[PDB]
Write a protein that binds this ligand. Structure first.
Ligand SMILES: O=C(Oc1ccc(CO)cc1)c1ccc([N+](=O)[O-])s1
Ligand SMILES: [Mn+2]
Ligand SMILES: [Mn+2]
Ligand SMILES: [Zn+2]
Ligand SMILES: [Zn+2]
Length: 146
C-alpha cells in the first residue's frame, strides 16, 4: 500500500524506453537520453551534472515523452531504488527524504503519478546490440570512452 504501484511485469503492448545517462567528473559535462522500440530516440547534453543526475534525467525524459502506459529499462540501481523507495514510503512513518538530487527526484515523481501504469526495471550494463547498449553508446559519446 503506497502512493502508487509500479507494475510487476512489463506492460504488454506499451512502448519501451531504454534510458541511460553518462557524466564526466572532471568537467561535469554529461548526456541523458533514450532509445525506444518504436524507433524513437533523444539525447540531451547537460552541464554541471553527475552520473546519478544523468541517469535520473534520462528517466524524466522517458516519462515526459511517453504515453499513459510506459516500460522503462534502466541500468542505474541508484535511480531505480530512490524512485521505488520514495513511492513505498511516502507520507509513511520513518521517512527522511534524501538530500542529494531531491529536486530532480521530486520532479520525476510528479511526472510518475500522472501516468496510468509504469513498469521500471533494472538491468546490468552489458554489451551487445539491444536497447541498453544503443543508448549507452549515445550518452557516452564525447563524455567517456567505452
Ligand atoms: O551509459 C553508460 O556508459 C557510461 C560510460 C562512461 C561514463 C562515465 O562515468 C558513464 C556512463 C553507463 C555505464 C555504466 C552505467 N551504469 O549505471 O553502471 S550507464
Ligand atoms: Mn547507465
Ligand atoms: Mn549504460
Ligand atoms: Zn556550468
Ligand atoms: Zn491504458
Amino acid at each position: 500500500g503506497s502512493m502508487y504501484q509500479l507494475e510487476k511485469e512489463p506492460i504488454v503492448g506499451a512502448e519501451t524506453f531504454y534510458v541511460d545517462g553518462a557524466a564526466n567528473r572532471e568537467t561535469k559535462l554529461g548526456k541523458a537520453g533514450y532509445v525506444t522500440n518504436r524507433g524513437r530516440q533523444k539525447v540531451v547534453t547537460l552541464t554541471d551534472t553527475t552520473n546519478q543526475k544523468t541517469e535520473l534525467q534520462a528517466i524524466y525524459l522517458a516519462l515526459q515523452d511517453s504515453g499513459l502506459e510506459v516500460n522503462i529499462v534502466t541500468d542505474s540501481q541508484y535511480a531505480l531504488g530512490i524512485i521505488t523507495q520514495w513511492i513505498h514510503n511516502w507520507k509513511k512513518r520513518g521517512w527522511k527524504t534524501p538530500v542529494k538530487n531531491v529536486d530532480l527526484v521530486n520532479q520525476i515523481i510528479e511526472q510518475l503519478i500522472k501516468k496510468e501504469k509504469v513498469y521500471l526495471a533494472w538491468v546490468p550494463a552489458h554489451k551487445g546490440i539491444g536497447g541498453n547498449e544503443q543508448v549507452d553508446k549515445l550518452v557516452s559519446a564525447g563524455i567517456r570512452k567505452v
